[PDB]
Symmetry: D2
Subunit: 106 residues, 4 copies
Amino acid sequence: ADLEDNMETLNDNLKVIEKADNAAQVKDALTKMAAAAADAWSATPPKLEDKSPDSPEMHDFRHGFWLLIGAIHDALHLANEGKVKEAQKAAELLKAICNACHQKYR
Amino acid sequence: ADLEDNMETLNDNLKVIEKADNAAQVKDALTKMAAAAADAWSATPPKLEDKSPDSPEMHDFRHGFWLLIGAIHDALHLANEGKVKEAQKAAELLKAICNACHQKYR
Amino acid sequence: ADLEDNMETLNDNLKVIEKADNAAQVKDALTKMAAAAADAWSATPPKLEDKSPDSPEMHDFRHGFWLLIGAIHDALHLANEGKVKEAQKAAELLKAICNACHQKYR
Amino acid sequence: ADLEDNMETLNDNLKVIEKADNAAQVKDALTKMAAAAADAWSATPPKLEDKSPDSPEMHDFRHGFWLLIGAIHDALHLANEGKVKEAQKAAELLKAICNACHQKYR
Ligand code: HEM
Ligand code: HEM
Ligand code: HEM
Ligand code: HEM
Ligand SMILES: [Zn+2]
Ligand SMILES: [Zn+2]
Ligand SMILES: [Zn+2]
Ligand SMILES: [Zn+2]
Ligand SMILES: [Zn+2]
Ligand SMILES: [Zn+2]
Ligand SMILES: [Zn+2]
Ligand SMILES: [Zn+2]
């Protein structure tokens, strides 16, 4: 899927988690976020279209997805353990990862 | 790319790291491995074609890619720091992640 | 060292990173933070003095240290790579880990 | 506790996991391993007694403990999720982390 679609999937599922009642909802939304982050991995953002695929900027861009993927990984373990409140909290915190990338590259 | 193509990319680049001379070679191979791992994320393996996309098996299958992605991440920092030998060691160690998934799912 | 002393070491070094000029300063402060977090690992906080060492709360308390140790780990690689600004950014972000544990257990 | 004691703790509990029947035994042993790894963090090994505390060797020494702590972290989530077999597998795999540090510094 395209970068915009993966970003919409990320945005929509984060909102789902905030509103969620049970573990199943949170688990499913995180799984979907994990897929979208991984699918966005090798995307070239408009701001970096002129840059080398192995430029410091693109390396830093990719690092941001590593960080997001890693945060979703832990949030899902928390949701798998029945720790729904803590998983929702982890989901809120990973917005800073979104924001940090967006500030530089969006 | 298809699962088999991504597995060959993983295989080929791990061999490149083993025989590598300098940091640039190791860095480039690891980046290529990271892209292949990420692109393999949502693949359904032959052995699990009958299974639910959100079965315990498929979640366990995806978990294995989380571990590989995470390992490649650290190895790349080591190579970025000029710690070539330790990056090569890290690449050798992550073979156990390849092996563990293969045993269960290949 | 005691929990309070490890907490002051964490606080003091985080402020050092914010005001830091070069990589060496950031590297040193993060190393000191890493040692303090690790030394804090087996501490029992006043709020959990009556709880079992293997209670859900103590397990969750320790989990917070795992997250902090992990975050410090990645920030140090960034500082090791000369990526000072992104290391400082990473240090800012991990304040959420401090805050999340404090909210529950301080 | 001293380095030798922490290494004995790591060794004894790894053996406990191998022989374990249920989740609770695996969970408790991993938690004990996590405590020992964290307590070993700032130890100076006999082989590096003459080295600077911030030499490449001591940074590499400490990095090995980050790796072990991270591996125990994941294994405990697996045991927490009732995935005992997988947790036991994960505990076997982290022996390579023990071995890799020993080869260099023991
Ligand atoms: C869960 C956290 C995230 C959320 C909620 C999120 C959400 C969004 C949204 C709603 C957009 C606008 C889509 C559009 O352009 O129509 C966007 C764009 C973008 N995001 Fe994210 N995102 C997240 C994570 C990230 C990360 C980690 C990165 C960097 C690695 C990133 C990089 C970008 C870039 C470069 C764009 C601009 C794409 C364009 O202009 O077409 N995002 N994001
Ligand atoms: C860096 C580590 C890895 C390496 C070096 C590697 C290498 C390979 C190779 C050479 C193949 C044979 C495909 C071919 O004929 O071209 C393969 C297949 C396969 N691997 Fe991996 N792999 C790794 C990681 C993983 C992981 C982490 C998983 C599971 C999460 C996985 C699951 C599979 C599956 C299901 C196949 C069968 C593909 C098919 O024949 O349709 N692999 N891998
Ligand atoms: C870099 C991250 C952190 C910073 C900068 C920080 C800072 C502080 C500070 C300044 C104090 C005041 C207590 C004193 O020293 O007199 C404190 C107390 C405390 N912190 Fe942290 N903290 C951090 C992370 C954490 C984490 C991760 C946990 C738990 C996992 C935690 C648990 C506590 C508890 C329980 C107290 C109360 C201890 C007492 O009252 O004796 N903190 N922290
Ligand atoms: C689960 C993994 C590990 C196990 C089972 C383990 C076990 C042991 C044991 C049984 C010893 C002998 C204790 C003695 O000196 O009488 C030892 C020594 C030692 N280990 Fe490990 N260890 C592990 C992880 C590590 C790691 C990751 C490092 C490096 C960061 C490390 C560094 C050392 C060093 C430097 C010694 C020599 C200490 C001395 O001679 O006083 N160990 N280990
Ligand atoms: Zn747009
Ligand atoms: Zn669209
Ligand atoms: Zn965790
Ligand atoms: Zn590392
Ligand atoms: Zn990183
Ligand atoms: Zn000895
Ligand atoms: Zn002793
Ligand atoms: Zn995991």
